[PDB]
Nucleic acid binder design. Structure first.
Ligand code: MG
Ligand code: ZN
Lengths: 244, 1321, 282, 55, 49
DNA sequence: GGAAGATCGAAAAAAGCACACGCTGACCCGCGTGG
DNA sequence: CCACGCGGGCGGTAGCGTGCTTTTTTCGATCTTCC
RNA sequence: UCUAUAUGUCAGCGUGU
């Protein structure tokens, strides 16, 4: 289908073309040439060469480089065939099925909060406001300070005091998942209760650092928001730092 | 040694003791001189463009009737200056013009005498010129061509250490690697065979090559073997006995010479037996008949009676064969001498293996080997073999390659032809045979004598030669095809291939890299960098490990400390301070020659190969007067190892202790007290520091800051001595001295400082003047300090009062606690400049243009916009504001450029580029007006100087003539020329001076017109776009928790809390500390240099405090002079000598003014101050000698139980800001194909939940969380909408749905021809 | 100890990149000033370690990914198969050193059959009781060396394993609950210390250090002319057993090894019992 | 497509392969294909009247 | 995003996945060496039916 | 005494090479043909 | 000098490549074992 | 969330590991 091989606009008046489109065009051109040659009652050698070249084009489209030499693009490199986007580290299986990018997620450096408890972690106010935007919208709609989603968006972007009170109220007992980039074992991601702090750095408990194998020398950690009741209970009862 | 004015401003105290015999060379020399060899005119054609032209030209045609030849080349005047190219986005380049002569021969005359000559000049593209600061300007951006460390051409012998054959046997290979051609290999087949391999294809026997070289079997056996003569005597066919052939073997038969039984049958021959045989002078010895069959006949023998070959060459003899030979009547035979270990029969076995028996068969086999699938033709095979290695065009060995080839083969001469020869191949094969036999040693790959450095010039020459041969092919085709009547040399050749290859090399090559402009140290390190990776080099994935290690030959050539950490470790290196490249490209280092036990001052540059032969002593060797070693046994490096040697055995000595380390490592004080890992990390981390609001000189330095600052182009260095006529924040005009004035020159030099210009890393580059009005200057003295530069000294960070103590856990692992006073003083505040571009391009619907009126915008939104449609200069802009108002026709939809969300700042510069032929907006007209005003002022300075001089001359002439000075004073200045004098020589010279005046005025007018034309020239843009608007925003970034801050000893951390000033610990005097550091990281990391630096900084600050106290009391100059003299004279036989008695009593006040903050101290890398000197310096001030004082808790106020280490430390702010790393996303854009959230902070993407996170979630047993993270949050579009609606409503429930990625995968597999679907049942 | 030794004492001998030890060590302290030669010598080891650390991560990640895949389909799905088969477990004994005792290996696991007290033929522990700390203490009080335990490899459950065979959850005191994915946990546990490992490629008689009885296993020996015993087997094992009856030391004697003392004879520390010639085989 | 009649002895195949304007020999397997003389004769008598896609 | 197309090839073409992925499925089914399959597929040698 | 299977070392082909994040540039057919 | 529309390895009257490890498949050469 | 802002790869790097 065309959408799976889109023709993205180049923003400069041109069109960026995928390798699959080039392979399909080559196959279609070869098929049309072979059809014309067959309809022209061509002799044996010419039609054999045309059929062989069509076979080579089909094999290149199905799996470039599997047999013979790969088809080179306009920038002197092998093209990406149908089999190339399935296998490998950049293939569909290992890039969009086993793992994928998620919403309601953030990333920031980690500092040390000596005053935090084992089940608590510091979170920036702006970062928490960005992460829990739909919850704030819902709470504002329920309370009655806003009548439409546009009004809630305007109130959130205006950063009113009522917005901050709602942000304080929503995450009173809403755990968040803190994870480090190298997740060697299950302890690399743990659930913590957020506490609003001033700044842009996540405050981490000193005791859990040995579990995270993290040092305060520029480390960056990601945070995810469990946005359903079952995930909230799972984080509270299984992945909480107190249970580990 | 009388210090310069900039040095007299602030003299750094030097604690070094080793005298300096060689000053530090120019850091950016390797980049410069090499490029000079690429562009300088060379009468001898071996370097650069002249060499390439001589290699390619002259070019003939298919028929001998026309010829194109090259005469000379000239580089043109670049269209725009470096600053103009940088601001306009064009590439700084110079036109290349070449003299080409086309000679049409006389075809009618058989002798081919010249018939017609046509000489012309042809333009062959633009060659990108290289700036004085060792960098290139490509497309308006700064790029650096780093050097490449690659294997030198020549022959190399290696062997696998038993990896293959699965029994530990070593296989030997010999590779001939040319600069340009086909690589050759000779490998040992485990069955003891020789195999020749070309271009790493299938192996072939080497005897095939030998036969292809017109060598018969007899000649090969003569060359590769020794002959034993078996001559039939009157009886028992005694043979010419050679005792050396009897070593290491047992004689099965009794030998009989003269009647003495030296060796009997069945006893092993000992060395005593060999000696007895030698003493007996035995020449002939009896041989049994059966022993003959074991040997192999060497030369073919034919029977005269039957006219047939008795035997061919090289097969095992037989009893029937020897009987037939005896009946034939041949008295003597020749056999090949073989041995188990001394002389292996590898050549004979290889000759047996191959099927080829003649030169033609060998050539046919070689052609089939090289070009499979082609008809084997004798002429084609001969041509291919000749061109493979014996053609100058196809095969070429450089001078370095020929020298290495001759040296490896023990050839006396080092100069030879580039093409290969038969003798060279035979010698290589013989050397490989000898190595197999146990004589000789294999070469070392990592040896710096086997690896050479290729600079920008060599690669540029190679690319230009490739383009030149392409152009030569094109011109050959044109000459062959075109007529011989109206051909012009310009039309024959096309400059497109030359320009294309040049721009590809200078912009898209891996070695061509974006120059990092974080600080001058980063630029210096990047320019002085050698990368093994690149074309014709190692790959990062397959680089291996054994190459990454530090070879012993790296001493004084490659710094082991300064290497990148990560995947490319050991593959990228930093050149040493004194390292330089030889004429062949091999790295060499200076040394001091030692003669008769005394260390002379003569300096000899030794390479890796030459260093091994001699014995070199280490730099840290005690030396008394007359350069005599005070110790009988001195540690020295002889051959890849260090050992004790006698004083007379030494031959060379290291020039200085900084030879080993590079500039980055040499800039780290107390390196010898620091761990190697921490030193490496600190050296790599010093390059990432960002310039601060104010540059603070390092209290503890190494004395190399001045060299780095001067060598780098960030600072302004006076070209000629003189006085500062005019000083300003933007420009400096200096009236040069009369002695340095060129004839017919105004005598003023104008330096235009660069103020607030963005760098490659979005930082701020600003130059501030460092001299005052009327201050005399000299050549080489710094005028304006560049970024991260203080008074000509490198200033990467700031000096902070640090204290090593735990503080309520706020430090912990590596975190840093920072006082509020640091933020209040804006010590670490930085300026970041960001560029935003708006493009106005001609779409098919209608040409878009910048207008102030935008559809559906509020009036307040357009307040910042002017009538032209551009944001006002200096108007503060927050997120979402409109910078440039652009509208695209539909009637018009808004396309105005807006700042990204979360980006603030102040607009500081607006640049408009308009394609020629399009109307110019009034904003561009204003920009041009200010540019022309600045140019007019710059020209008018010189115009006024020259006019004043000329009018003074005419006034003097008129006073001498008619004596009318008073009338001139009363008369207007401009009406002095119109006055008429009496008819004499005075009138004639007055007319001449008037002519000179009007000529000068017209010359200045044409110069101004040329400048205006240059600045008003339309910019060249890409097709389809007619306007570009660039807006620069300046943002002040202040220190805050999460920012990464570090030091020079590898200690790093992040800010944890900006504590109040009252909470900091304070000493008895009440002064609080600024930085609190955890001591726990000192012993484990083994970085003790930071503690010594802290103590030295404390001593320096104590001295500075004493100086400040003296100054505040208005003490007399005598007391300050005495105190500063005592402070400078402190030390233990320091080499630095400072005399204040010759400072005119006025520069002492300036020095004390500069020393009030502190006393800078120079601590060499390995010849630094000892602990005793530090204690003495501390005792000089009113500070304890232990370095630890007693403080009190700021919050509580009781006494600290133990003294803590508090001092002054140079701390750097890294380029890792928390505001640039923090990101958060709830909902946003999604990918078109996979329907997944985007990636990256710039695209407002979401964090990726990788495989490891999924595994951790499964291990935790959480299933609902994993499903929510997998489908609803990322892929399920209906799930996404339902979740958003439910959360807005207030219900936290989720539907599983169907991820789109699985549907895409199923569709792809279906399109692969394989049917896949899900079954409901 | 090593880091303080380097800080306040001389660094000592170092090694070349190949591996050979440099003849001249470093006699300078980190507090003192190392010369150029000593720093250049140390840079070899520093760069070797840095390169090893940089290059180990790829292999560690590949190994942990393969391990995660190979066990991604293993979950607990039953309580007890009823199988009486298991793995025999004894403390690891080799050379003249004991690394892991029986208590450490046996802790947190269930038994395969009724383990009996030695010399009494009385059931020391029941058949299917999980061995916690108290059970381990009781087992070690009776000087028991061999315990048969139920292992995952011996689990009779198909398409999964049972909770009893797996044993303790190792993260909680109680037994492992049903539904826990143990394959992923095991793979992550194995792959986590992968970075701590190293990817580098770096006698004629037996010695007795303790006092106890001597036992010979798989031995058919003969008396020589002088009365000494010489073995006629290639799989002859010697066990030194303490007074309590548990195996303390283990050795594997080679062919043609003379015996200083016979089986069942007490020996003292520092004595040599077996002597042999490794250069040639008589 | 072109049909070139030549002797490889007189001029090598690689020279024709490097001729300007010629893409490559039509080859099956390693060796280049050989066109029989019957095909050449038929082509010399092969005279069709047709149309083309641009036409 | 779901509708697919089809091209009617005038001549059959063998699937590369079932042919080059060792062991070759076509070669195993026909019990003949791979090189003969390559020769007949790319019009190098005829095969009898 | 010739064929069959067999086996054994050697040569050729295929698959893999940790994760996460941030930044920059450099394209994203060229050319004979046509109007 | 403003589109344009199909083969494509590029360019040339040939050659370009060239520093990993492990596993799987097949082949030539022998061998060896017999019916 | 189809409310803004809705591309890809190659090369060079750097950071945490
Ligand atoms: Mg860290
Ligand atoms: Zn079980």
């Amino acid at each position: 289908p065309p959408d799976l091989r889109p023709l993205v606009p180049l923003d400069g008046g041109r069109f960026a073309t995928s390798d699959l489109n080039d392979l399909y065009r080559r196959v279609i051109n070869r098929n049309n040439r072979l059809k014309r040659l067959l309809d022209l009652a061509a002799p044996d050698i010419i039609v054999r060469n045309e059929k062989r070249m069509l076979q080579e084009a089909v094999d290149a489209l199905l799996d470039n480089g599997r047999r013979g030499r790969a088809i080179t693009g306009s920038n002197k490199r092998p093209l990406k065939s149908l089999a190339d986007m399935i296998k490998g580290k950049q293939g569909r299986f290992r890039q969009n099925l086993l793992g994928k990018r998620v919403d309601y997620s953030g990333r920031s450096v980690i500092t040390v909060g000596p005053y935090l408890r084992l089940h608590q972690c510091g979170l920036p106010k702006k970062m928490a406001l960005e992460l829990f935007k739909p919850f704030i919208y819902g709470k504002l709609e329920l309370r009655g300070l806003a009548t439409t989603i546009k009004a809630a968006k305007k109130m959130v972007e205006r950063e009113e005091a009522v917005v901050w009170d709602i942000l304080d109220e929503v995450i009173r007992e809403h755990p968040v998942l803190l994870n480090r980039a190298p997740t060697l074992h299950r302890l690399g991601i743990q659930a913590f209760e957020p506490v609003l702090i001033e700044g842009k750095a996540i405050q981490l408990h000193p005791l859990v650092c040995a579990a995270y194998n993290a040092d305060f020398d520029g480390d960056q950690m990601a945070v995810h928001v469990p946005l359903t009741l079952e995930a909230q209970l799972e984080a509270r009862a299984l992945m909480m730092s107190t249970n580990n | 040694m009388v210090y310069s004015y900039t040095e007299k401003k602030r003299i750094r105290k030097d604690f070094g003791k080793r005298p300096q015999v060689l000053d530090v060379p120019y850091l950016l020399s390797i980049q410069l001189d090499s490029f000079q060899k690429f562009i300088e005119q060379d009468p001898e054609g071996q370097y650069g463009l002249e060499a390439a032209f001589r290699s390619v030209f002259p070019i003939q045609s298919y028929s001998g009737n026309s010829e194109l030849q090259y005469v000379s080349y000239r580089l043109g005047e670049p269209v725009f200056d470096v600053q103009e190219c940088q601001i306009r986005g064009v590439t700084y380049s110079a036109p290349l013009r070449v003299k080409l002569r086309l000679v049409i021969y006389e075809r009618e005359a058989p002798e081919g005498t010249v018939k017609d000559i046509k000489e012309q000049e042809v333009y062959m593209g633009e060659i990108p010129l290289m700036t004085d600061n060792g960098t290139f300007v490509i497309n308006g951006t700064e790029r650096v061509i780093v050097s490449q460390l690659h294997r030198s051409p020549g022959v190399f012998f290696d062997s696998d250490k038993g990896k293959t054959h699965s029994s530990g046997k070593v296989l030997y290979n010999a590779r001939i690697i040319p600069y340009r051609g086909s690589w050759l290999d000779f490998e040992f087949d485990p069955k003891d065979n020789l195999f020749v391999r070309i271009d790493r294809r299938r192996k072939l026997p080497a005897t095939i090559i030998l036969r292809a070289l017109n060598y018969t079997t007899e000649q090969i056996l003569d060359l590769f073997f020794e002959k034993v003569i078996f001559e039939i005597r009157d009886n028992k066919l005694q043979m010419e006995l050679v005792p050396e052939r009897l070593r290491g073997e047992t004689a099965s038969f009794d030998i009989e010479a003269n009647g003495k039984v030296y060796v009997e049958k069945g006893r092993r021959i000992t060395a005593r037996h060999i000696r007895q045989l030698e003493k007996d002078d035995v020449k002939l010895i009896e041989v049994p008949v059966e022993y003959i069959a074991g040997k192999v006949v060497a030369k073919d023998y034919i029977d005269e009676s039957t006219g047939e070959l008795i035997c061919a060459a090289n097969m095992e003899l037989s009893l029937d064969l020897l009987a037939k030979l005896s009946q034939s009547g041949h008295k003597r035979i020749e056999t090949l001498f073989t041995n188990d270990l001394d002389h292996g029969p590898y050549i004979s076995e290889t000759l047996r293996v191959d099927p080829t028996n003649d030169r033609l068969s060998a050539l046919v086999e070689i052609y089939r080997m090289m070009r499979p699938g082609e008809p084997p033709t004798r002429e084609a095979a001969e041509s291919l073999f000749e061109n493979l290695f014996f053609s100058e065009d196809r095969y070429d060995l450089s001078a370095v390659g020929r020298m290495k080839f001759n040296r490896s083969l023990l050839r006396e001469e080092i100069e030879g032809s580039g093409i290969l020869s038969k003798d060279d191949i035979i010698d290589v094969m013989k050397k490989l045979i000898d190595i197999r036999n146990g004589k000789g040693e294999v070469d070392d790959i990592d040896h710096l004598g086997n690896r050479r450095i290729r600079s920008v010039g060599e690669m540029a020459e190679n690319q230009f030669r490739v383009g030149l041969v392409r152009v030569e092919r094109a011109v050959k085709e044109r000459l062959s095809l075109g007529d011989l009547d109206t051909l012009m040399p310009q039309d024959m050749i096309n400059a497109k291939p030359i320009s294309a290859a040049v721009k590809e090399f200078f912009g898209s090559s891996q070695l061509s890299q974006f120059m990092d402009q974080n600080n001058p140290l980063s630029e210096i390190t990047h320019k002085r960098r050698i990368s093994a990776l690149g074309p014709g080099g190692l790959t990062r994935e397959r680089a291996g490990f054994e190459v990454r290690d530090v070879h012993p030959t790296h001493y004084g050539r490659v710094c082991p400390i300064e290497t990148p950490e990560g995947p490319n470790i050991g593959l990228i290196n930093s050149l040493s301070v004194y390292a330089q490249t030889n004429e062949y490209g091999f790295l060499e280092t200076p040394y001091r020659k030692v003669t008769d036990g005394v260390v002379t001052d003569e300096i000899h540059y030794l390479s890796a190969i030459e260093e091994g032969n001699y014995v070199i002593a280490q730099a840290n060797s005690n030396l008394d007067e007359e350069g005599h070693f005070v110790e009988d046994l001195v540690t020295c490096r002889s051959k890849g190892e260090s050992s004790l040697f006698s004083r007379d055995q030494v031959d060379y000595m290291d020039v200085s202790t900084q030879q080993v380390v590079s500039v980055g490592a040499s800039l780290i004080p107390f390196l010898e007290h620091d761990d190697a890992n921490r030193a490496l990390m600190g050296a790599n981390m010093q390059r990432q520091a960002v310039p601060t609001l104010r540059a603070d000189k390092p209290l503890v330095g190494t004395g190399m800051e001045r060299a780095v600052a001067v060598d780098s182009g960030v600072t302004a260095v006076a070209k000629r001595g003189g006085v500062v006529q005019y000083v300003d924040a933007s420009r400096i005009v200096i009236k040069v001295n009369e002695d340095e004035m060129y004839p017919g020159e105004a005598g003023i030099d104008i330096y235009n400082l660069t103020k607030y210009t963005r760098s490659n890393q979005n930082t701020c580059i600003n130059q501030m003047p460092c001299v005052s009005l009327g201050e005399p200057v000299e050549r080489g003295d710094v005028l304006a300090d560049g970024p991260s530069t203080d008074l000509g000294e490198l200033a990467l960070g700031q000096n902070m009062r640090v204290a090593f103590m735990p503080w309520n856990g706020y430090n912990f692992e590596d975190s840093i606690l920072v006082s509020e006073r640091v933020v209040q003083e804006d010590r670490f505040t930085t300026i970041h400049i960001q560029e935003l571009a708006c493009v106005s391009r001609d779409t098919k619907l209608g040409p878009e243009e910048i207008t102030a009126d935008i559809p559906n915008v509020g009036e307040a939104a357009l307040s910042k916009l002017d009538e032209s449609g551009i944001v006002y200069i200096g108007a503060e802009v927050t997120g979402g504001d409109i910078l440039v108002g652009k509208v695209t026709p539909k009637d018009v939809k808004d396309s105005s450029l807006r700042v990204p969300n979360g980006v603030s700042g102040t607009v500081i510069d607006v640049q408009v580029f308009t394609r020629d032929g399009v109307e110019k907006d009034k904003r561009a007209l204003e920009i041009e007006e200010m540019q022309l005003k600045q140019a007019k002022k710059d020209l008018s300075e010189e115009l006024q100087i020259l006019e004043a001089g000329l009018f003074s001359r005419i006034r003097a002439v008129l006073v001498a003539g008619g004596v009318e000075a008073e009338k001139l004073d009363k008369l207007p200045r401009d009406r002095w020329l119109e006055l008429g004098l009496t008819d004499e020589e005075k009138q004639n010279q007055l007319e001449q001076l008037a002519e000179q005046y009007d000529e000068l005025k017209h010359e200045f007018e044409k110069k101004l017109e040329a400048k205006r034309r240059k600045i008003t020239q339309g910019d060249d843009l890409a097709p389809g776009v007619l306007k570009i608007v660039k807006v620069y925003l300046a943002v002040k970034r202040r220190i805050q928790p999460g920012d990464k801050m570090a030091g020079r000893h590898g200690n790093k951390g992040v800010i944890s809390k900006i504590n109040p000033i009252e909470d900091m610990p304070y000493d008895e005097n009440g002064t609080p500390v600024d930085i609190v550091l955890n001591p726990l990281g000192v012993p484990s990391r083994m970085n003790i240099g930071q503690i010594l630096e802290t103590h030295l900084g404390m001593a320096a600050k104590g001295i500075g405090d004493k100086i400040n106290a003296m100054l505040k009391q208005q003490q007399e100059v005598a007391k300050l002079r005495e105190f500063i003299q005592r402070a400078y004279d402190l030390g233990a036989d320091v080499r630095q000598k400072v005399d204040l008695s010759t400072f005119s009593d006025e520069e002492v006040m300036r020095l004390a003014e500069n020393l009030r903050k502190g006393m800078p101290i120079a601590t060499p890398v390995f010849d630094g101050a000892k602990e005793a000197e530090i204690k003495e310096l501390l005792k000089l001030g009113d500070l304890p000698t232990s370095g630890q004082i007693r403080l009190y808790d700021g919050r509580t106020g009781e006494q600290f139980e133990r003294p803590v280490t508090v001092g002054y430390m140079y701390m750097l702010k890294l380029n890792h800001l928390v505001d640039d790393k923090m990101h958060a996303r709830s909902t946003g854009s999604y990918s078109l194909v996979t329907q997944q959230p985007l990636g990256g902070k710039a695209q407002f993407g979401g964090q990726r939940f990788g495989e490891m996170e999924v595994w951790a979630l499964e291990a935790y047993g959480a299933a609902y969380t994993l499903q929510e993270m997998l489908t609803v949050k990322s892929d399920d579009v209906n799930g996404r909408t339902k979740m958003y609606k439910n959360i807005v409503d207030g219900n936290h429930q989720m539907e599983p749905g169907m991820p789109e990625s699985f549907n895409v995968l199923l569709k792809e597999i279906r399109s692969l021809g394989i049917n896949i679907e899900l079954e409901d049942e | 100890a090593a880091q303080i030794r380097q800080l306040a004492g001389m660094r000592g001998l170092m090694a070349k990149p190949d591996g050979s030890i440099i003849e001249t060590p470093i006699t300078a302290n980190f507090r003192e000033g190392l010369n150029v030669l000593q720093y250049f010598i140390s840079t070899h080891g520093a760069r070797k370690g840095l390169a090893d650390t940089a290059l180990k991560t790829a292999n560690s990640g590949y190994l942990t990914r393969r391990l995660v895949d190979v066990a991604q389909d293993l979950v607990v799905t039953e309580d007890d198969c009823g199988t009486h088969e298991g793995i025999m477990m004894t403390p690891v004994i080799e050379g003249g050193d004991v690394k892991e005792p029986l208590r450490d290996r046996v802790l947190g696991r269930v038994t395969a059959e009724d383990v009996l007290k030695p010399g009494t033929a009385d059931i020391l522990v029941p058949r299917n009781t999980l061995l916690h700390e108290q059970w381990c203490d009781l087992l070690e009080e009776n000087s028991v060396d061999a315990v048969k335990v139920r292992s995952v490899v011996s689990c009779d459950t198909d398409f999964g394993v049972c909770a009893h065979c797996y044993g303790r959850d190792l993260a909680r005191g109680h037994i492992i609950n049903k539904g826990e994915a143990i394959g992923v946990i095991a793979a992550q546990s194995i792959g986590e210390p992968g970075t701590q490992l190293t990817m580098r490629t770096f006698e004629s008689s037996i010695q007795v250090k303790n006092k106890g009885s001597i036992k010979l296993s798989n031995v058919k020996s003969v008396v020589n002319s002088s009365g000494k015993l010489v073995i006629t087997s290639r799989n002859t094992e010697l066990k030194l057993i303490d007074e309590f009856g548990r195996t303390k030391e283990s050795y594997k004697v080679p062919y043609g090894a003379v015996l200083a003392k016979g089986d069942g004879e007490q020996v003292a520390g520092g004595e040599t019992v077996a002597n042999w010639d490794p250069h040639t085989m008589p | 497509y072109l049909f070139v009649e030549f002797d490889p002895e007189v001029i090598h195949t690689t020279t024709i392969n490097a001729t300007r304007g010629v893409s490559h020999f039509v080859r099956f397997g390693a060796s280049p294909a050989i066109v029989p003389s019957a095909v050449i004769h038929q082509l010399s008598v092969y005279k069709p009247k047709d149309i083309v896609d641009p036409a | 995003r779901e509708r697919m197309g089809h091209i009617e090839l005038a001549s059959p073409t063998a699937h590369i996945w079932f042919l080059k992925s060792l062991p070759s499925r076509i070669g195993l089914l026909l019990d003949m060496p791979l090189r003969d399959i390559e020769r007949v597929l790319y019009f190098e040698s005829y095969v009898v039916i």
